[PDB]
Amino acid sequence: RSYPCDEKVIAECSNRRLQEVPQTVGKYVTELDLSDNFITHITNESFQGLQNLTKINLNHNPNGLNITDGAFLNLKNLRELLLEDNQLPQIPSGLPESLTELSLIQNNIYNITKEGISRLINLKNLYLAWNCYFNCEKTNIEDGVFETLTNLELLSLSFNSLSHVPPKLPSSLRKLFLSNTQIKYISEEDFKGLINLTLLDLSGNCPRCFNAPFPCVPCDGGASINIDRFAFQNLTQLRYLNLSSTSLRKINAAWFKNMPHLKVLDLEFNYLVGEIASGAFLTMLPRLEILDLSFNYIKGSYPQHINISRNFSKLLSLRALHLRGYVFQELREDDFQPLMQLPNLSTINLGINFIKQIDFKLFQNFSNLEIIYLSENRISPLVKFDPHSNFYHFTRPLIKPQCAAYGKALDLSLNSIFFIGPNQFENLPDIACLNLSANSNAQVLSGTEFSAIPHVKYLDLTNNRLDFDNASALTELSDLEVLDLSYNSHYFRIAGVTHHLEFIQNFTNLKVLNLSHNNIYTLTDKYNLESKSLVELVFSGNRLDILWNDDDNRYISIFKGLKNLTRLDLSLNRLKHIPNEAFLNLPASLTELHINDNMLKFFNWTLLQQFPRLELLDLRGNKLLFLTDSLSDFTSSLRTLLLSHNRISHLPSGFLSEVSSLKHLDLSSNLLKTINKSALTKLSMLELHGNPFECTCDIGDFRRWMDEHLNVKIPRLVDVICASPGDQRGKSIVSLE
């Protein structure tokens, strides 16, 4: 059995509290990840007899790291070497020339000398970020240090006190990163011989200090980055340009004269309100797809409308427009006239703009609109950290891909819609995906509210105060497949009416329903509970304990009518015990059942006979004390059984040698002391970490079983620690002799 690393050939050996490099690693290993360990020393004997290695990860070691000269030199096949967050005072000496990837981020490297990297001619990707950052005083770049690296495609020098663009850069460069490098002025000679440059990042130089995870210092006298007219004169191949947080007031149109392939342009966190109103540079970008002009607002300025230049109609290739934090009161049809002529424009981002009123008729004017993002605005009822991240642009999808896949998406979440008005969805396009999350919506749903958009397939109504007790609630949305009513708190509770879940029956296509954290302790559905389409139900964070503890036993067949249900989540329901009759009434069509994070003192395993389709049973975070011995007689379909964070002290005799269908069995964080031969198949995984094991002679039977059943993978063996005796405490069960 592979110890302490997990073989897959890639060997995962990260976060295992290793004080030194393990010599128990196989010679056949090509990739070794030793990150997040307490390793302090690296020598030539650390990777002895490992010529087959290509990738070595030694990040965040310890919790600095001492590396001898030519410690990696013996490895002729080493191509990737990650040495991030190691507190290295300089570049490691005698590095192998075979390297193509090198990452030296978050170290104390203040000098980029020829003695360290000039020998490495095979380097393709080089990362030297967060080295001389707020310590430093200036990063010493040796004259023509990168000139010898003629095969360098990517060079990241971001987050370093540079002041000036490094001279004598290789012509092979395709991606250049110089973010937060204190470079105030850019000249024509800075990017002269870079004919193959596709990416240029100059963000955070003379910045507009906002919500940043890193220290921000703006330039003296509110100064902007000074870029010469002829600075980007020979960057014909540039596709990506990042000029975020550069305190720009004006954009010279001449910068894009010899730039006809520009695909992405980042201009967020600048002072360009005037440039948005009249932009000459907009006629210079016919191949631009993504444009970000976010958080460009004037401090204390709340205008009536957004001033969009007519030159926005010249952006023929535009697919995405990000106009967050412009801050304006009203959006009219006339204001967005230049964008209406754009054929590829599918995404509009108007989040965090505090817009009070929008003339929603303007969105059906667009040719190919797919995403309308209006989150964190003020629309009211209408009546009659990691360094390898994009810090200034949001990479996360604006709408959940599950929602957006159905069709036209509209996000009206975190607004002032405290009730759905009769003209709320007036003159709106054919929306298939709608988000009305955290609007504090206290609407009594009757089946008249969503009449204007009756083709919604995915509806997010989370964190509201909605009333869906009426049988005709949401019935106007016949094509509805997904309904998310998570964290909904009833504001007009009626005894003998709340909760009335009769509305779900009327839907012919509703497959996914989530009424989690709704605080359902009362049901009034006289007849239970039919839905021939529903496959997934999330009933987590409710009060099933109250419902099933009922003296009259009224809610005994609460989910019996859902004869198509495959997944059921009953977690966080404060369940101490499930009545035998109530469990038998659960749909026999279930494949996945979650009863985790409850207070279950006991569980009737015999009742599993009425569930012949059950493959997954989640019983984690409960108060279960014992297990069954005759599990084979109750189940023959169960594949995954999660019993972690329980009070199981003994494994019954003939448990593993009963269930033939079982593959994954989690018994971690329990009260197991020993595993016997009698208790000891198609099992592929067995979790046992965080158990108080007695490392004596009684554990010997289970150790022999581990060597006899090598295929049964036991994860994180280092966390399978002995509780007693004192001399064996701390050590792993596999480390015994």
Ligand X SMILES: *[C@@H]1O[C@H](CO)[C@@H](O[C@@H]2O[C@H](CO)[C@@H](O[C@@H]3O[C@H](CO[C@H]4O[C@H](CO)[C@@H](O)[C@H](O)[C@@H]4O)[C@@H](O)[C@H](O[C@H]4O[C@H](CO)[C@@H](O)[C@H](O)[C@@H]4O)[C@@H]3O)[C@H](O)[C@H]2NC(C)=O)[C@H](O)[C@H]1NC(C)=O
Ligand Y SMILES: *[C@@H]1O[C@H](CO)[C@@H](O[C@@H]2O[C@H](CO)[C@@H](O[C@@H]3O[C@H](CO)[C@@H](O)[C@H](O)[C@@H]3O)[C@H](O)[C@H]2NC(C)=O)[C@H](O)[C@H]1NC(C)=O
Ligand Z SMILES: Cc1cc(-c2[nH]c3ccc(C4CCNCC4)cc3c2C(C)C)cc(C)n1
Ligand U SMILES: *[C@@H]1O[C@H](CO)[C@@H](O[C@@H]2O[C@H](CO)[C@@H](O[C@@H]3O[C@H](CO)[C@@H](O)[C@H](O[C@H]4O[C@H](CO)[C@@H](O)[C@H](O)[C@@H]4O)[C@@H]3O)[C@H](O)[C@H]2NC(C)=O)[C@H](O)[C@H]1NC(C)=O
Ligand V SMILES: *[C@@H]1O[C@H](CO)[C@@H](O)[C@H](O)[C@H]1NC(C)=O
Given the rule CB under 6 A, which residues bind ligand V? 41, 66, 68, 192-193, 195, 233-234, 316-317, 337, 340, 343-344, 365, 446-448, 470, 472, 511, 532-533, 535, 564, 566, 580, 589, 604, 606-607
Q: Respond yes or no on whether the N-terminal peptide bond of residue 194 is cis (omega within 30° of 0).
A: no
Using CB under 6 A as the binding rule, whether residue 512 contacts ligand X is answered as yes
- Residue 538's binding partner among ligand X, ligand Y, a copy of itself, none (Cβ under 5 to 8 angstroms by kind) is ligand X
Nearer to a copy of itself, 9 or 494 (CB): 494
Q: Which is nearer to ligand U, 384 or 396 (CB)?
A: 396
Retrieve residue 664's tokens.
């994954």
Which of 354, 605, 626, 705 touches a copy of itself by CB under 8 A? 354
Shortest reach from residue 504's CB to ligand Y, in Å: 19
Cβ distance to ligand Y smaller for residue 154 or 535: 154
Using CB under 6 A, list all residues that contact ligand Z: 295, 297, 299-302, 325, 327, 352, 376, 418-419, 440, 442-444, 465
Quick check: helix, strand or coil at residue 277? helix
Q: How many residues does the chain have?
A: 737
- Interacting partner of 212 out of ligand Z, ligand Y, a copy of itself, none (Cβ under 5 to 8 A depending on kind): a copy of itself
Helical (H) or strand (E) element with 11? strand 10-12
Residue number closest to ligand Y, CB atom: 242
| HEC profile of 449-482 | CCCCCCCCCEEECCCCCCECCCCCCCCCCCCCCE
| Neighbouring residues of 310: CB distance < 8 A, sequence distance ≥ 6 | 337, 338
Which C-beta is closer to ligand Y: that of 53 or that of 403?
403
Binding mask 453-472 for ligand U (x = CB under 6 A): -------x------------
Output the DSSP codes for 360-428: GGGGGGSSS--EEE--SS---------SSS-SSS--S-SS-HHHHTTSEEEE--SSS-SS--TTTTTT-
CA distance 246 to 223: 9
Please give the Cα distance from 256 to 284 (Å, whole number): 6
Using CB under 6 A, pick the residue from 378, 400, 511, 563 that binds ligand U: 400
Q: Provide the 3-class DSSP secondary structure of residue 117.
A: helix
Q: Is the dihedral of CA 489, 352, 307, 254 positive or negative?
A: negative
The HSE-up count of residue 452 (CA atoms within 13 Å, CB side) is 15
Closer CB to a copy of itself, 96 or 207, in the complex: 207
Min separation Cβ 216 and ligand Y, Å: 12
Question: What's the start-to-end Cα distance of the chain, in Å?
Answer: 15
| 223/494 with CB nearer a copy of itself | 494
Indicate the residue among 267 and 686 with the shorter CB distance to ligand X.
267
* Shortest reach from residue 125's CB to ligand V, in Å: 24
- Whole-angstrom Cα distance, residue 147 to residue 698? 66
Read off the DSSP letter of residue 502: G
266 touches ligand X (CB under 6 A): yes
Partner from ligand X, ligand Z, ligand V, none binding residue 442, C-beta < 5-8 Å depending on class: ligand Z
Q: Does 119 bind ligand U (CB under 6 A)?
A: no
Q: Quick check: 407 and 432 in contact, CB under 8 A? A: yes
Question: x/- string (CB under 8 A) for a copy of itself, residues 624-643?
Answer: --------------------
Closest distance of CB 451 from ligand Y, Å: 21
Chain positions 130 to 149 lying near a copy of itself, rule: CB under 8 A, are 134
Helix/strand/coil for 483: strand
* Residue 636 contacts residue 657 (beta carbons within 8 Å): no
- Pick from 495, 551, 697, 708 the residue near a copy of itself by CB under 8 A: 495
User: Per rule CB under 6 A, is residue 401 in the interface with ligand U?
Assistant: no
Q: Single out the residue of 153, 536, 545, 701 in contact with ligand X (rule: CB under 6 A).
A: 536
Among 254, 438, 444, 616, which residue sits at the site for a copy of itself (rule: CB under 8 A)? 444
Residue 150: count of CB within 10 angstroms of its CB:
12
Nearer to ligand Y, 52 or 172 (CB): 172
Question: Are the C-beta atoms of 691 and 720 separated by less than 8 Å?
Answer: yes
Should residue 392 be labelled a site residue for ligand X when binding is judged by CB under 6 A? yes
Q: What is the 3-state secondary structure (H, E, C) of 658-700?
A: CCCCCCEEECCCCCCCCCCCCCCCCCCEEECCCCCEECCCCCH
Q: Does 492 bind a copy of itself (CB under 8 A)?
A: yes
Q: How far apart are CA 505 and CA 503, in angstroms?
A: 6
Binding site for ligand Y (CB under 6 A): 175, 179, 199, 201, 203, 240, 242, 264, 266, 375, 388-392, 399-400, 403, 413-414, 435, 437-438, 460
Residue 414's binding partner among ligand V, ligand U, ligand X, none (Cβ under 5 to 8 angstroms by kind) is: ligand U
Q: Which does 518 bind (CB under 5 to 8 A by kind): a copy of itself, ligand X, ligand Y, none?
A: none
How far, rounded to the nearest angstrom, does the alpha carbon of residue 59 sit from its chain's CA centroid?
21
* Residue 504 CB, nearest approach to ligand Z (Å): 22
Q: Which residue has 């010599």 as its token pair?
A: 23
- Indicate the residue among 203 and 732 with the shorter CB distance to a copy of itself: 203
Residues numbered 470 to 509 that lie near ligand X (CB under 6 A) are: 482, 484, 486
Residues linked to residue 516 through DSSP beta bridges, in sequence order:
none
- Interaction of residue 402 with ligand X, rule CB under 6 A: yes
> Alpha-carbon distance 11 to 737, whole Å?
25
Rg of the Cα trace of the chain? Answer: 31
Residue 210 binds which one of ligand U, ligand Y, a copy of itself, none, with CB within 5 to 8 A depending on kind? a copy of itself
Q: Which does 264 bind (CB under 5 to 8 A by kind): ligand V, ligand Y, ligand U, none?
A: ligand Y
Interaction partner, residue 438 (a copy of itself, ligand Z, ligand Y, none; CB < 5-8 Å by kind): ligand Y
Name which of residues 74 to 113 contact a copy of itself (CB under 8 A): none
Dihedral angle, C-alpha 395, 396, 397, 398, nearest 10 °: -100
In whole angstroms, give the CA distance from residue 440 to residue 453: 21
Kindly state whether residue 535 participates in binding ligand X, applying the rule CB under 6 A.
Answer: no
Q: Is 396 in the site for ligand U (CB under 6 A)?
A: yes
297 binds, among ligand Z, a copy of itself, ligand X, none (CB under 5 to 8 A by kind): ligand Z
Question: Which of these, 47, 102, 104, lies nearest to 76 by C-alpha position?
Answer: 47
Quick one: 294 or 635, whose CB is closer to a copy of itself?
A: 294
Give pairs for 544-553: CB < 8 Å, separation 24+: 544/570, 544/573, 544/574, 544/575, 545/573, 545/574, 545/575, 545/576, 546/521, 546/522, 547/520, 547/521, 547/522, 547/523, 548/575, 548/578, 548/579, 548/582, 553/579, 553/581
Task: Give the residues lining the site for a copy of itself (CB under 8 A).
Answer: 134, 209-212, 215-218, 299-302, 354, 356, 378, 380-381, 383, 416, 418-419, 421-422, 444, 491-496
Task: Give the residues lining the site for ligand X (CB under 6 A).
Answer: 175, 179, 199, 201, 203, 240, 242, 264, 266, 388-392, 402, 462, 482, 484, 486, 512, 514, 516, 536, 538
Task: Give the residues lining the site for ligand U (CB under 6 A).
Answer: 375, 395-396, 399-400, 403, 413-414, 435, 437-438, 460
